[PDB]
Design a protein around this nucleic acid. Structure first.
Lengths: 129, 126, 107, 82, 208, 84
RNA sequence: CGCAAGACGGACCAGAGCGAAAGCAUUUGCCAAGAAUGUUUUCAUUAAUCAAGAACGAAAGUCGGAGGUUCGAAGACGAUCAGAUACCGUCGUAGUUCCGACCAUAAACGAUGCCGACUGGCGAUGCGGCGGCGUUAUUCCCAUGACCCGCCGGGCAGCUUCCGGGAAACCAAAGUCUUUGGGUUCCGGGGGGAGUAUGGUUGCAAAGCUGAAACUUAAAGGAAUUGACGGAAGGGCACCACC
């Protein structure tokens, strides 16, 4: 069955972009999917998206450009300690310079750059570049 | 059989014929003289074997175009033949007979045309 | 290294089927595996019908057939060239064929 | 690809597919674009002045290059009701 | 429209097309071709969109102009129905030729005696002419093509839907292309009609 | 799948061909009707697929029998859909 | 020609069905059961997968009966061979069959854990539903019915494909794996010693489960490639081959 819903949305995306696709319909969506789709959006990795309202759990249409090499999800959502964030981005990001680790902290779902600036930390959601 | 002409020979025959058709002939005796004029061939037996196969070709060419040989004269002949065109065949005769839908093909194409209806029955696969 | 994706001969959706006995070795092979060839032939044959038509009463008549559905295990059907090794490529063709229907003027 | 003092370094900036916005990179010679002529309006008279699209090896091997051209040609004309 | 007017449909042409029985289309659609399809006739057969067949053909024509050296657009057919057809196209527009047994190594392979470096290939059957379509994709050359409803879309950018089952459908479409390209960047002038009878394109064949 | 659809606005025809659960936003593919039988003049509302015998207001009549799917309405009967 | 016994359900019968798997083809009736579909029915998280425990589990074998037609693990025979305890012939055993208990294993192979999503074309076929001013079959029209064509689910599969995987053979799953992170369970760490010793456990028995070491040894092994070679198949060619 389903343990997580994010992992499906992310994968669906990745296969869309790999095909050469410019849109996807993910299902079923969640506040966390929105928040993650949103961080991606702010940065450029996707275009605009749209939450369609079935009387159920939702369905999202993402319009994607093609700046996206990969958006992954980290499971389980490990706790990170401010100097485990430095260790994570190195593990899974292309160059020190770019790509984001996106985690969930007490003060919001955020990319790790925003994390560093706020100076808060938490549990790791996923990534992209 | 036992005498199957080899490429060195067969090539020369295609060769000469390509650059020599209107010069060459039906008859062994003369091409053989011609090979002396138009080619330098080292032994007499080879030159004979060449003259001979190329004649077998000329005998064949002069009865129907042969699979891989072209000469200026044959090109001209095909060229002229490849003109034909009559009273012309479609007509098609007053009125096209349609299969309908093909009738509905014009009907919904904004197009007048001549007519006739005979298009019904389905319609098995295989 | 696996040779035929079909393994033996077509099962897929079973795990079992009753076995038949070769019509030559009296062997034993699953019915899914096993070369089968129908065999319909006249009671009389080639030459006979002419003496068979002349000697009989009846005005024509008009010949029964014997019908027999054969089964062979692999080794017999190979042995006797019912079927013959086909190249790594030719094996894939299920089809069947020849050019006329050999019935009197064939090989 | 800036350097220290806003300078432009390494050695080239590749063209990007007209359909997928993905780098044509650089030795993939199973890919090409397509210069469409501009017309001096009115009609005929090829006047330059290319309208051009580049399509990736990928799209083409996936049995697109064509349509992509059409989304491309109509969206920017010519081509209408495609 | 687009480029602005006259260039639109013309009954005169929609008449030659319907006459040549282009739009008739294959019973097997194929997925990448679905757009061309107007409607499915009863008793199985599909009606291609001549309007669409038209416009793409013009789009093709335009791509053939814009190549500067007309010789180096290669019109290609191994199919008989398209052999005199392409020979004619090559006569009118610059356009060098490749009929019959394409000959493998013609685009890849300098050494060869049919070595050609076209800047544009136009093919008549993507299934029959698969070799040229493959070789072309080894060396960055765009492709126009003859496609019925069930033709390979791989490595072909620009299709002009036809019928290619045959008759004059293959004749007319090559005709109209040459007619179109001579108009554009050529010198017909006055996307007015033909002194050339389209039959001149069209297959020959046998003799008793 | 040629890198071309508007997943958000798909066509009504190919939306209408798809499984009820596969529809863009889901929705059913079943309906209601009013049914007649001259002898009476009033009208019973009925569900397109039905399982139950449905009998009319008064007359022990019939008014379809069930099946694998849509109820088969019975002989001499009439039916407007229908609403919203 | 009849009749008895015991056995078994041929042809029809398929890259066809069902069943958790092992496995399952005569008719008909009763008994409960199982999936798919349809379903604007009902519940509101009931749920995924699993140490321990447990159900089933082809064959042989074992316990006691029935039964032994057929064929036949052993034996005795006739041939063959230099040897033949074999293959081959014959006689023929327990056994095959059936009932009530054991036993728990089969290249029990799809040699491929189970569950969920996503990524690709076409046509079959079992089945359900849906749609057609399509065919044919009827009555006075029907309700019928079987088909053709299309659509959608869920079966077993197939076919063709430089997506992608893999060492390749291959693989639409063995894909989405260095760009390594959906859930869970199990087993392996060179080859032999060894499924062996030893203790425990289960078994009437035969045996099954768990399972070492000492020592031994530098390759064991896989895949593809190519010859050589064949009492494998189509091939040829020559009086150093036959005719």
């Amino acid at each position: 069955v389903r343990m997580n819903v994010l992992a499906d949305a992310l994968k669906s995306i990745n296969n869309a972009e790999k095909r050469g696709k410019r849109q996807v319909l993910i299902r079923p969506c969640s506040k966390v999917i929105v928040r993650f789709l949103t961080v991606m959006m702010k940065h450029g990795y996707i275009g605009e998206f749209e939450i369609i309202d079935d009387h159920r759990a939702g369905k999202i249409v993402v319009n994607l450009t093609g700046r996206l090499n990969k958006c992954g999800v980290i499971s389980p959502r490990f706790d990170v300690q401010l100097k485990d964030l430095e260790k994570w981005q190195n593990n899974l990001l292309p160059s020190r310079q770019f790509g984001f680790i996106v985690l969930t902290t007490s003060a919001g779902i955020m990319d790790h750059e925003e994390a560093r600036r706020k100076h808060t930390g938490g549990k790791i959601l996923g990534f992209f570049f | 059989m036992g005498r199957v002409r080899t490429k060195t020979v067969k090539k020369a025959a295609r060769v000469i014929i390509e650059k020599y058709y209107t010069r060459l002939g039906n008859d062994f005796h003369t091409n053989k003289r011609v090979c002396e004029e138009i080619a330098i061939i080292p032994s007499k037996k080879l030159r004979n074997k060449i003259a001979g196969y190329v004649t077998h070709l000329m005998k064949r060419i002069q009865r129907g175009p042969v699979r891989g040989i072209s000469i200026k004269l044959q090109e001209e002949e095909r060229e002229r033949r490849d003109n034909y065109v009559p009273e012309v065949s479609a007509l098609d005769q007053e009125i096209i007979e349609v299969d309908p839908d093909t009738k509905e093909m014009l009907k919904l194409l904004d197009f007048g045309s001549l007519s006739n209806l005979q298009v019904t029955q389905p319609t098995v696969g295989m | 290294t696996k040779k035929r994706r079909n393994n033996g001969r077509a099962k897929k959706g079973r795990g079992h089927v009753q076995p038949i006995r070769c019509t030559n070795c009296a062997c034993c092979v699953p019915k899914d595996k096993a070369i089968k060839k129908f065999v319909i032939r006249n009671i009389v044959e080639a030459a006979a019908v002419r003496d068979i038509s002349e000697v009989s009463v009846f005005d024509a008549y008009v010949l029964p057939k014997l019908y027999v559905k054969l089964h062979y295990c692999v080794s017999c059907a190979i042995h006797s060239k019912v079927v013959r090794n086909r190249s790594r490529e030719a094996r894939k063709d299920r089809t069947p064929p020849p050019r006329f229907r050999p019935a009197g003027a064939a090989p | 690809m800036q350097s220290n003092a806003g300078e432009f370094v390494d050695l080239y900036v590749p063209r990007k597919c007209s359909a997928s916005n993905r780098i044509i990179g650089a030795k993939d010679h199973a890919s090409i674009p397509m210069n469409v002529a501009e017309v001096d309006k009115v009609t005929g008279r090829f006047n330059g002045q290319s309208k051009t699209y580049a399509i990736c090896g990928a799209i083409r091997r996936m049995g697109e290059s064509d349509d992509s051209i059409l989304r491309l040609a109509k969206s920017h004309g010519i081509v209408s009701q495609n | 429209s687009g480029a602005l007017d006259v260039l639109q449909m013309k009954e005169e042409d929609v008449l030659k097309f319907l006459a040549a029985g282009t739009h008739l289309g294959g019973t097997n659609l194929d997925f990448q071709m679905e757009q061309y399809i107007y409607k499915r006739k009863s008793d199985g057969i599909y009606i291609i969109n001549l309007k669409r067949t038209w416009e793409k053909l013009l789009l093709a024509a335009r791509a053939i102009v814009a190549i500067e050296n007309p010789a180096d657009v290669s019109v290609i057919s191994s199919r008989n129905t398209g052999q005199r057809a392409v020979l004619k196209f090559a006569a009118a527009t610059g356009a060098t030729p490749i009929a019959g047994r394409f000959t493998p190594g013609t685009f890849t392979n300098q050494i060869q005696a049919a070595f050609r470096e076209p800047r544009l290939l136009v093919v008549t059957d993507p299934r029959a002419d698969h070799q040229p379509l493959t070789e072309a994709s080894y060396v960055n050359l765009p492709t126009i093509a003859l496609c019925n409803t069930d033709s390979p879309l791989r490595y072909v950018d620009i299709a002009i839907p036809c019928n290619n089952k045959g008759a004059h459908s293959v004749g007319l479409m090559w005709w109209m292309l040459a007619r179109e390209v001579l108009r554009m960047r050529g010198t017909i002038s006055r996307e007015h009609p033909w002194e050339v009878m389209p039959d001149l394109y069209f297959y020959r064949d046998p003799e008793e | 799948m040629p890198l071309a659809k508007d997943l958000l606005h798909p066509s009504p025809e190919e939306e209408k061909r798809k499984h009820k659960k596969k529809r863009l936003v889901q929705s059913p593919n079943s309906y209601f009707m009013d049914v007649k039988c001259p002898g009476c003049y009033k009208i019973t509302t009925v569900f397109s697929h039905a399982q139950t015998v449905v009998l009319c207001v008064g007359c022990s009549t019939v008014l379809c029998q069930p099946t694998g799917g849509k109820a088969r309405l019975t002989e001499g009967c009439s039916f407007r859909r229908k609403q919203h």
